[PDB]
Amino acid sequence: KYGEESRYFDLKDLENTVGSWDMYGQEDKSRYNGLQSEFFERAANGLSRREYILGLVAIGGAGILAWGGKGAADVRLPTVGPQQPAQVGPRGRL
Amino acid sequence: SHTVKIYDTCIGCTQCVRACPTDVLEMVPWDGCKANQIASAPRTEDCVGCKRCESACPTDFLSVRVYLGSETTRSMGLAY
Amino acid sequence: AFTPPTLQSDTPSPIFGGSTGGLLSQAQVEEFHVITWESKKEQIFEMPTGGAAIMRQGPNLLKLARKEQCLALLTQLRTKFKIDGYIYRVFPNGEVQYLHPKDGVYPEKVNAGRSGDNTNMRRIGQNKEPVQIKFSGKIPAEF
Amino acid sequence: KKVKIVVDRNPVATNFEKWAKPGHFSRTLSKGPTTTTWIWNLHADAHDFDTQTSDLEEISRKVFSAHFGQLGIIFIWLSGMYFHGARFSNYEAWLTDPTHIKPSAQVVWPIVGQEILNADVGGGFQGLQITSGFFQLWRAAGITSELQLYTTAIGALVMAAAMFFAGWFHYHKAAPKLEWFQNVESMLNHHLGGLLGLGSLAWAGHQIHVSLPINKLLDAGVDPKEIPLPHEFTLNPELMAQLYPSFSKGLAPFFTLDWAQYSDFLTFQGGLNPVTGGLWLTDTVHHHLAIAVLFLIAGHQYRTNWGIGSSLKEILEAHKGPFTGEGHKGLYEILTTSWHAQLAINLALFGSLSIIVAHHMYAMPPYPYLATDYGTQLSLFTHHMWIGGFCIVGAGAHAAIFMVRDYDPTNNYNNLLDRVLRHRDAIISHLNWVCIFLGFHSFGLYIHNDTMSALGRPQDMFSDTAIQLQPVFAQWVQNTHFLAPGFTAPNALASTSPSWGGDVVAVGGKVAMMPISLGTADFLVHHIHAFTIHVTVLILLKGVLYARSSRLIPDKANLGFRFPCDGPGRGGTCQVSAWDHVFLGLFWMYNSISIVIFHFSWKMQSDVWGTVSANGVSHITGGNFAQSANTINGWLRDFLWAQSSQVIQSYGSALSAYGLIFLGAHFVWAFSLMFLFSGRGYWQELIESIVWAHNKLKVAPAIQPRALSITQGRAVGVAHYLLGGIATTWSFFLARILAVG
Amino acid sequence: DVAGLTPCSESKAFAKRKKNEVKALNKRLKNYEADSAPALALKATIARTEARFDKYAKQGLLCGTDGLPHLIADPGLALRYGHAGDVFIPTIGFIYFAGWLGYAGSKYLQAVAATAKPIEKEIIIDVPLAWKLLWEGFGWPLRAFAEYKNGSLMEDDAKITVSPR
Amino acid sequence: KVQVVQPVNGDPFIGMLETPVTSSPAIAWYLSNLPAYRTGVSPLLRGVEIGLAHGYLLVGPFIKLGPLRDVENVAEIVGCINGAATVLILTLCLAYGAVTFQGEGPQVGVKTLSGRSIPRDPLQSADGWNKFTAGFAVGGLSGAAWGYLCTQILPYY
Numbered sequence A: 001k002y003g004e005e006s007r008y009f010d011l012k013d014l015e016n017t018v019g020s021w022d023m024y025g026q027e028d029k030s031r032y033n034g035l036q037s038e039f040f041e042r043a044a045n046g047l048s049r050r051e052y053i054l055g056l057v058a059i060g061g062a063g064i065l066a067w068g069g070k071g072a073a074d075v076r077l078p079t080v081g082p083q084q085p086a087q088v089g090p091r092g093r094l
Numbered sequence B: 001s002h003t004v005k006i007y008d009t010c011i012g013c014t015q016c017v018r019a020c021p022t023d024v025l026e027m028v029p030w031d032g033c034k035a036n037q038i039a040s041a042p043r044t045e046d047c048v049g050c051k052r053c054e055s056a057c058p059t060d061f062l063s064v065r066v067y068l069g070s071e072t073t074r075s076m077g078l079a080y
Numbered sequence C: 001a002f003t004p005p006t007l008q009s010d011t012p013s014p015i016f017g018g019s020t021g022g023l024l025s026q027a028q029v030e031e032f033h034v035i036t037w038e039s040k041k042e043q044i045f046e047m048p049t050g051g052a053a054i055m056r057q058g059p060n061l062l063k064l065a066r067k068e069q070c071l072a073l074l075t076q077l078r079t080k081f082k083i084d085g086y087i088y089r090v091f092p093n094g095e096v097q098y099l100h101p102k103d104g105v106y107p108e109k110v111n112a113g114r115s116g117d118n119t120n121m122r123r124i125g126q127n128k129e130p131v132q133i134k135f136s137g138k139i140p141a142e143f
Numbered sequence D: 001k002k003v004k005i006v007v008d009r010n011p012v013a014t015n016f017e018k019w020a021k022p023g024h025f026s027r028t029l030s031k032g033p034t035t036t037t038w039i040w041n042l043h044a045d046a047h048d049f050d051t052q053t054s055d056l057e058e059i060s061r062k063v064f065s066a067h068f069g070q071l072g073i074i075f076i077w078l079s080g081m082y083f084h085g086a087r088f089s090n091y092e093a094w095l096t097d098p099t100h101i102k103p104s105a106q107v108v109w110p111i112v113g114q115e116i117l118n119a120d121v122g123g124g125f126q127g128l129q130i131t132s133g134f135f136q137l138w139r140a141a142g143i144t145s146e147l148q149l150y151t152t153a154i155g156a157l158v159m160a161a162a163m164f165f166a167g168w169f170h171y172h173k174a175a176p177k178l179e180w181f182q183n184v185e186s187m188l189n190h191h192l193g194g195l196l197g198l199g200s201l202a203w204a205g206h207q208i209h210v211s212l213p214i215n216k217l218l219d220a221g222v223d224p225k226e227i228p229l230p231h232e233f234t235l236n237p238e239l240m241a242q243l244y245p246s247f248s249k250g251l252a253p254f255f256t257l258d259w260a261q262y263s264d265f266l267t268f269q270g271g272l273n274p275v276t277g278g279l280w281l282t283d284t285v286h287h288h289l290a291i292a293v294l295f296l297i298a299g300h301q302y303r304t305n306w307g308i309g310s311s312l313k314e315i316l317e318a319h320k321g322p323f324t325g326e327g328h329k330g331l332y333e334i335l336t337t338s339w340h341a342q343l344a345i346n347l348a349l350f351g352s353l354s355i356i357v358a359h360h361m362y363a364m365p366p367y368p369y370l371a372t373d374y375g376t377q378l379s380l381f382t383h384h385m386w387i388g389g390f391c392i393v394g395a396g397a398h399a400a401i402f403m404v405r406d407y408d409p410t411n412n413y414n415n416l417l418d419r420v421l422r423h424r425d426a427i428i429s430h431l432n433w434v435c436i437f438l439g440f441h442s443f444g445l446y447i448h449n450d451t452m453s454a455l456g457r458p459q460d461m462f463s464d465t466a467i468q469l470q471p472v473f474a475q476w477v478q479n480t481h482f483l484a485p486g487f488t489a490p491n492a493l494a495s496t497s498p499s500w501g502g503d504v505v506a507v508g509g510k511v512a513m514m515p516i517s518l519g520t521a522d523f524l525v526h527h528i529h530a531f532t533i534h535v536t537v538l539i540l541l542k543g544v545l546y547a548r549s550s551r552l553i554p555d556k557a558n559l560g561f562r563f564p565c566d567g568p569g570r571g572g573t574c575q576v577s578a579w580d581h582v583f584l585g586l587f588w589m590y591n592s593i594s595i596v597i598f599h600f601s602w603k604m605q606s607d608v609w610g611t612v613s614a615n616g617v618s619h620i621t622g623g624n625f626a627q628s629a630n631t632i633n634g635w636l637r638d639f640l641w642a643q644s645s646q647v648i649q650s651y652g653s654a655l656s657a658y659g660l661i662f663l664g665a666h667f668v669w670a671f672s673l674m675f676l677f678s679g680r681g682y683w684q685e686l687i688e689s690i691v692w693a694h695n696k697l698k699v700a701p702a703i704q705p706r707a708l709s710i711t712q713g714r715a716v717g718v719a720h721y722l723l724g725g726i727a728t729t730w731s732f733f734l735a736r737i738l739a740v741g
Numbered sequence E: 001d002v003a004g005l006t007p008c009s010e011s012k013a014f015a016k017r018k019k020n021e022v023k024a025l026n027k028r029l030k031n032y033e034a035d036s037a038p039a040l041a042l043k044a045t046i047a048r049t050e051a052r053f054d055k056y057a058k059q060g061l062l063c064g065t066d067g068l069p070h071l072i073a074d075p076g077l078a079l080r081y082g083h084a085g086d087v088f089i090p091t092i093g094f095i096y097f098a099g100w101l102g103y104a105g106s107k108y109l110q111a112v113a114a115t116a117k118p119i120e121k122e123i124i125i126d127v128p129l130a131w132k133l134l135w136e137g138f139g140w141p142l143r144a145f146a147e148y149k150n151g152s153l154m155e156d157d158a159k160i161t162v163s164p165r
Numbered sequence F: 001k002v003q004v005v006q007p008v009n010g011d012p013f014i015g016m017l018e019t020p021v022t023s024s025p026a027i028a029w030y031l032s033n034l035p036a037y038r039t040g041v042s043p044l045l046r047g048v049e050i051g052l053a054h055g056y057l058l059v060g061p062f063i064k065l066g067p068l069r070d071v072e073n074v075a076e077i078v079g080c081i082n083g084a085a086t087v088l089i090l091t092l093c094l095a096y097g098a099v100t101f102q103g104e105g106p107q108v109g110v111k112t113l114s115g116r117s118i119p120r121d122p123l124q125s126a127d128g129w130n131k132f133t134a135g136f137a138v139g140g141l142s143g144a145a146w147g148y149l150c151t152q153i154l155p156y157y
């Protein structure tokens, strides 16, 4: 910047003059306590790869289809329940 | 990336150059008209396509023809 | 011959209160333009991004998102103030490219020593028919 | 310095030489109409005085004389209404029986079978049933005579002649100078006190000496023929003391400040007169006197030729805070030197005033027998709503015009205008987000209700019987108003309106006003109103804020307020001008006001208007709003299809004109779609082919026929669209409310 | 009977429609006194309706399934069956009057085209010239046929602008 | 006399303005203290915390408003719905990180509001966003699971 007065451009310091700032991001190592960080990185260990996090979505879609197979009827839902008589129509039809 | 062309019906009135808001057109020396100047488009990469030059051309039919083509971040006139 | 003026980075900026129409994310990773002009007095002009700014005595430095904003500011300086200026293209890697008054004099005045490209020696109606240039990746007017 | 009358003696000669040459006012219209675009631009720039002269003095004089001409036109209109009430009306017959006789003040000539439009209104009279409410207003003023309406018509014709003479005199003989128009202190001091305050005081005097005794006799029940004339009620305090006993002591308790003895005719009850269903005229007298005193007090705030008073500039420039920089610095100069800014402010507050008028006049009728005539009530509300919305859009337009033309950045540095212009992106983005949030949480609620009704799940839709959305704040505000008398309004004997709560006011077997209950459907439609208002504000504010400049187009102020585009470049810059923002805001105001008046008509046909049968109230539609106005199919079917049967089966009756206009306005609305969807190049090329056809037969006009300009096409399209939609709604409303009620 | 249609003089539904209209107007009558202005207006409306129905039955119009007059727009089919006044005679009348107006406008265009300022004469109309040409346009068919036979009515294609294809 | 609206970092040519809400010390501290602006700690734990917060967030609308809101077993069906929502938001993160982090772009950099250089955040990388997506995986399903368990152990529900 070199904004000691009204100079907001500088080719030797072109980083600050363009407007690239952190706004709120600050660097700090301290945040999460012990043991729990290891617990969570072990919980999300091999899943970090793109193929296995895709496979998680694959088993999620498998659950989506498992709802339709056996799961829609377990919460009743009218689309798989029974039916009660019928209606004829305007004229002699069915 | 707009195709801007100048044709020999240009009378060198410099109105297309004055109408340009991104400085695409300029006058180069010429011998085909009374004013001894013709328009040229060396900076068509800065052309947005506003066709203000066509609105300023008094020749019938106009001599500064703009053909809208490939779109870039400058042809689309984006500030973001 | 003509030489382009250098972009003096430590140039004062006009007095301004801060706008929302200024630079954005395009400046950091593509390009932002800048305009430099000499003012003979402290007076108020209009920003291309909205609002009023006071340019100061001597050199004034203003960076803008697009070249069209720089030319709008330059043409309003030339009409309402009779003040010339220089516009530069500044890449984020550091390279600065000179822009509008490229050969010293304004493009509406001849200079004898320019490139007369994109100037066809035919009429509008003397272009080729599109069937004669079929399957070429070009419009009829750039043959 | 020193407010005084300054004029110029004989500036403009009076003759007909410029009448011979059209387009004289502007230089760009000179040298004849080479094209028909000249013809269109001649009407387009007739009132654009900024493009005619650069002098503010001549512009101000033109504006003053145009105001005089408009006042003359309004006086001609008033004279015509009073003349039609005198000659071609059943006003005396209606006075005897206002409950059953339908008002009528226009008859038609039997020429082509159009005498069927002369309705059987009653009183041995045939004519068109009017919905303007002049009969109720005249009864409130205490006319009760045909000769007095004719005398008022003649007086209004004389006043129209006076207005036109004043305009000619102030443009041609004594035209005021620029500094005369800039005496805003004196203008406010005279408009507050001498116009509004003195007018309110004079109307209070008329109401005391004319309206109160005659309407008192009418309410007690007396044929208007034997009622004493207004002057003899005004002439002596004897008859007044018989009707209002406080007139026996005259003006003595007024000057001794024992004003409580005037409580028989200066009252404060609230509610409605049960005989007529209108407000108590003594309450209106007390209101007019109080506001007249308040306005005459307000008329001494500003400093003129004497040291007392405060200057507007001083009050403005001292209202500066830390959040806003210089504050109101420059507002005095941009309002005493720019007519468009004042026009924007006045149009905004004028349209808001018209909307407030519509609200306060349905909520609690001020004229006798106005509530019972549902036709004039619905018509008056809808008319004032549309006038208010139009004036608001014009306010946005003229704010944009001021931003383009009369905005100087030199004298507007770091002030409120500058502060707003320097963060316009934040305001516009946030209004955009509010509009999207309101659109979702209003329209998507209706769509969810549609989907659940169509899925056979009425328990899952938002309704009073399922998932409730109750307007608890509005209901509690109604409760606060209903409980106001005797508590927070100790001197009020009744609430301001029956809409808050209480008993049903019935006049002549019809409900004057009854309490309005708010449920889920009212919640949904109020949020719809908020959404539509917010989007119209978004378009108008965006046009005003980006009229000067933009990220896409940095020099939009150079191109002007009214330009079509800046070419197909930058992806396309169609409709970037502030004019096109007004053009879109016109449609959005149309949508907003249409939904508002639809909600009004359905809500009061379903829950307010109706007949009494000494065991309940039988509404017009039967309470169907609470269970059908939360569903778009309910609006389409139970309101827009059920109530449309009156206008489509109106052929062969007096409402056949409404039936015909109902289709003609559909035609005009769809005719707008030509201009709105198409573009100029097609019509220009088609006109070229037609010009070839004319050239073949030597019938080519010298004035070259051109297609309408892009702004011309947009203006024609929006004008036809709004005309067709508003006239369709007008014919529907009037036919429905005059066939059933 | 030109197309399965019956004359309205003998068609029953025409008389039924006339009776229904007169009965509706009488129902409107039966609310006022005999000599009131609405009574006179309704009596005039009734007289106009009966006169219109009797005239339609007199002129020989054709009624369809119900009592509504139908018009014939075929020469010959209307000439030999006596219904040329349905379409043919008004066709001739419109052609004459529209040709009168169009020829008057055309002659005004060619009269003011050869003046000093033809631009001004089309917004500022020379009223005596317009009146004279409106009078002269009553002989439009003979004048138009004479100018067509002379060849001065149409313009050569080589003197008319076209687009470049 | 008191100034509260200022240009950000001095130059009046950037799109922000200093405002007592976008840079008040309490709100600035709160925004800097959110996990998403912790460039120092590993992105996986940050994604874990974000997923926990969002998974425990999404339980409520489905509980009180879903199609089966009026039956006793609403909690389990809402846990299933939130698992599906976590999966679809997870594949949204997958697609985003796969399309925006397919290469590299080391331009300009980033500095703080005072004038100190700072690294350009390990989250904005192909491997860094993979850890964030994996963190949102275990966190998102756990927040839904804890939301289900909160329906039976809370006294006031």
Ligand code: CLA
Residues within 6 Å of the ligand: D012, D013, D014, D015, D016, D017, D018, D019, D025, D061, D062, D063, D065, D066, D068, D069, D070, D073, D164, D165, D166, D167, D168, D171
């Ligand atoms: C018969 C008296 C008379 C005469 C001979 C003139 C003559 C003149 N006037 Mg003037 N004027 C008059 C009366 C008169 N005026 C009155 C009574 C007023 C008050 C309203 C004005 C206010 C006035 C102003 C403010 C101006 C003039 C101007 C002019 C000069 C040129 C403009 C012009 O007239 O074009 C022709 C005008 C017309 C043919 C009529 C205009 C349209 C009328 C007003 C419409 C009224 C509404 C009407 C009912 C239509 C409504 C809609 C309808 C379809 C239902 C001209 C020499 C202008 C000038 O001096 O130029 C600098 C100027 O700006 N006049």
Ligand code: CLA
Residues within 6 Å of the ligand: D063, D064, D067, D068, D071, D180, D181, D183, D184, D186, D187, D190, D191, D193, D194, D195
């Ligand atoms: C007590 C003094 C007084 C009164 C009653 C008025 C009243 C009015 N003024 Mg005015 N004005 C005044 C003082 C006054 N003014 C002063 C001191 C100035 C100089 C600063 C102005 C400057 C001014 C301007 C620039 C304009 C007005 C306008 C108007 C009209 C408002 C529009 C309207 O339709 O209202 C309601 C309509 C009526 C109430 C109809 C009644 C009309 C009668 C004739 C009012 C008579 C009052 C008049 C001042 C008496 C002196 C004139 C006399 C020689 C006949 C209105 C009639 C506007 C206008 O429309 O122009 C005509 C407008 O353009 N005034």
Ligand code: CLA
Residues within 6 Å of the ligand: D043, D044, D045, D046, D047, D048, D049, D343, D347, D390, D391, D392, D393, D394, D395, D397, D401, D561, D562, D579, D582, D583, D586, D719
């Ligand atoms: C106090 C009210 C008021 C006043 C004094 C003005 C004054 C002005 N306006 Mg404005 N405006 C207003 C209200 C007002 N407006 C409202 C309420 C709207 C919203 C609709 C607008 C929207 C608006 C726009 C978009 C524009 C203006 C413009 C202008 C300026 C030029 C007007 C002109 O000559 O164009 C010509 C005027 C006419 C040709 C009159 C005809 C207009 C339509 C066709 C009439 C509507 C038809 C009518 C209802 C009859 C229908 C029945 C039919 C079947 C016979 C002028 C100074 C123009 C400008 O450039 O500003 C500088 C501009 O473009 N106004």
Ligand code: CLA
Residues within 6 Å of the ligand: D667, D668, D670, D671, D672, D673, D674, D675, D677, D678, D686
């Ligand atoms: C109800 C809607 C509507 C209507 C009435 C029309 C009507 C018309 N279109 Mg159109 N069109 C529409 C919608 C509509 N369009 C839409 C939505 C589109 C898509 C954008 C198009 C696109 C389109 C194209 C591309 C073209 C047309 C063309 C035409 C014209 C065809 C010629 C004709 O049939 O003569 C019939 C005449 C009429 C229907 C006009 C009504 C008669 C008037 C009312 C009589 C005047 C009486 C009175 C004086 C009215 C003024 C009142 C005022 C003074 C108060 C015609 C005027 C073609 C054309 O131009 O033809 C050469 C053409 O090329 N249209």
Ligand code: CLA
Residues within 6 Å of the ligand: D689, D690, D693, D694, D697, D699, E101, E102, E103, E104, E105, E106, E108, E125, E129, E130, E131, E133, E134
């Ligand atoms: C008297 C002038 C005049 C004349 C002789 C003609 C003649 C013609 N026109 Mg044209 N036209 C006119 C005026 C005129 N037009 C005007 C003012 C307009 C703008 C509304 C048009 C718009 C128009 C269109 C869009 C088309 C034609 C077409 C045609 C041709 C088809 C026949 C027809 O009647 O179409 C219909 C004509 C009209 C619908 C317009 C009639 C308007 C009035 C009645 C005429 C003007 C009267 C004039 C003022 C009288 C002056 C009297 C004089 C003593 C001062 C024909 C040769 C069509 C064509 O090209 O055919 C191949 C066609 O597409 N006209």
Ligand SMILES: CC1=C(C/C=C(\C)CCC[C@H](C)CCC[C@H](C)CCCC(C)C)C(=O)c2ccccc2C1=O
Residues within 6 Å of the ligand: D674, D675, D676, D678, D679, D680, D683, D684, D706, D707, D708, D709, D710, D712, D713, D714
């Ligand atoms: C139809 C149409 C035209 C053609 C319109 C024309 C040529 C105007 C036709 C007006 C004629 C000449 C006058 C007709 C007069 C009528 C009898 C009454 C008109 C109402 C006036 C009194 C105002 C355009 O030029 C256009 C331009 C841009 C967008 C859309 C369109 C568009 O839709």
